[PDB]
């Protein structure tokens, strides 16, 4: 006859980690309160270091005969609030005001990560049969990198997975397949000479131009030609130019950044191999070069849309949830580099409009909600 | 039996002008320091205020009877001398080594100027005999914006030449034709959007690149069909470019800067309504418009080379003088904007490979020579 852990204390344990600063970093502050969490409750988490003061949290629960390992991931940084003047209420005090819950991080993804740490308490002690494991992965530094993610996966823990649920903000909806991301870096090497004799020079602006105008023309056939069903066509847009030193001397230096988005029919490789030739077309006959830095590279997520994972989650409801794609990458694109096959989907509490936008909030029905959905969730996956 | 001008003296004028710092301002303490000298010899000279610091000086002197205007003209700003650790001499110090006088300045154009003063007062004191007037006509400001030249021209002071000599650096040449300078800024408005999610925005450096692929072609087909016999084709360079907040974002806002040595085949009109249209072109069927702002606008210059000026210069060599173009503007761009024409020709002492450049110096027997040059010069025009 022990006792219920009571909603005041559900909402406070949320409330604690979104009044822990993460902002790319600091997350060996939030696995530390999880694991003492857990650790109240008689389940003992791994810590697993990044660097210093960046700790990645592993927990696992285990019942019945061996079965099926069935993992839920969040990750713990949150990106940065920005002007705190610009927010109604203060992005790290975690206010309550009616059903919402205000907070950098709320949406994103504190809620689902605190839901998917109770549901597994709240699981092993309603003493409900199953036969498996659940295992919590906490990572550090999904925003920029997906470090913690990249991490754990070489290091072998993702190894074990039959099935795994990613916390990220979808609300009522299934996400199982994401589009990749690439960031690229074009640098430009010239001559300087002055703008009234440039014979001697060479013009790193133009070399650049004739990259944009060639890399824009290739990848808008490419968007013309091929797509993906639920994610669309690859997009393409370059975000950052600068060049030259004065109005009156020929440019000897330009560079560019720009920003992919991929999908699985024309894959991140051949993405860069092309990029690659138009550079190498461009440096014909000429020794002052563009060269070509790839900066970020994250892989386009497909699952299988009908996976017992998802069956058992359209199981929890009277009607099913809707499937979808998004665009944005998630730990996905690390985890899925392991060395076999698992179910996926990304299913999480939260306001999809919300992630890193001021005012962010959750709403506190939907993350209690979600706290007892997940204990279904497993009890129907790993039966 | 009035005593001669030492050599010691002519020498030390143009040190004393050149340790005058006059970088983009301050041309009132060299116009104050030559006017002085004017009256030391009974010449008065004319101050003609710029702004305050920048002033002008116009002086005449006449014998004879009302016959032709010869001006002599020169500016009294100097470029910056940059890093002064890098010169060998101190850039303002004037010191002499051997034939050199080292100092910014010292060949653009200050030995040019202090030679036309200096001759005039040696025309004067020699009593020898001519018809007409000669006037100096020193500038403020020709390197940035030709301040003075287009000063004095609004204001009525070139109505009365005949002929023009501009005593920049051309050694023993006649430069008597140059290219025009145009500088041009576009900028490009555009909205910003998540990488991710694009359709919501503008991207600003696209439509950018498509006016420099644009620009670029329709200066290379102008280089390539019409062309000067001594000046060459237009020249167009894009010189600086800017864009973009972030590499996730959709560009809101981009610019560039270029450009343009213009021939008189092709005039500044014309270019400037070429940008016009491609810009008009470019923004068909959009509200996210490219805008066209134009800088700088300086004309070519094309005198006669057969002109009567240019027949009492070679008259002073056994041999004829070579006759050439440049691409750099003088102040000559404002001045034959006065509504009469009149014989121009480019002719002072000074290394021409060493204007703007460390360690500028003026060969002294070059300047010496100058002084005698100049008063043949004006009686044999003035005859
Ligand atoms: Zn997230
Ligand atoms: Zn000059």
Redesign the interface.
Known sequence: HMASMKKEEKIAILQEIIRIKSVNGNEGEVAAYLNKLLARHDITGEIVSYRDGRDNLIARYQKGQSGKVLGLSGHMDVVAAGDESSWTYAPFAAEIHGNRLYGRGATDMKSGLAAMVIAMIELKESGKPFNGTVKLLATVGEEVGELGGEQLTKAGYVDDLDALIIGEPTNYSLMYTH?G?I?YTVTSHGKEAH????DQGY?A??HL?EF??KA?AEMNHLAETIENPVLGKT?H???????????????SH?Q????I?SIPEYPNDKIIALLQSIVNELNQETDYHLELMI?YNKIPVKADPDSPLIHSIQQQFSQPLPLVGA??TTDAAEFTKANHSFDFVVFGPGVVTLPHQVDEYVEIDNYLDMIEKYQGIILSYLA
């Open positions: 589009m991301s960031n703008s009234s004799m440039p013009n602006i133009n131009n944009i105008t824009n997009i847009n370059v975000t950052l130019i600068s060049g030259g030193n004065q109005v009156n001397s020929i440019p330009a560019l950044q720009g920003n988005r900066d665009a944005a």
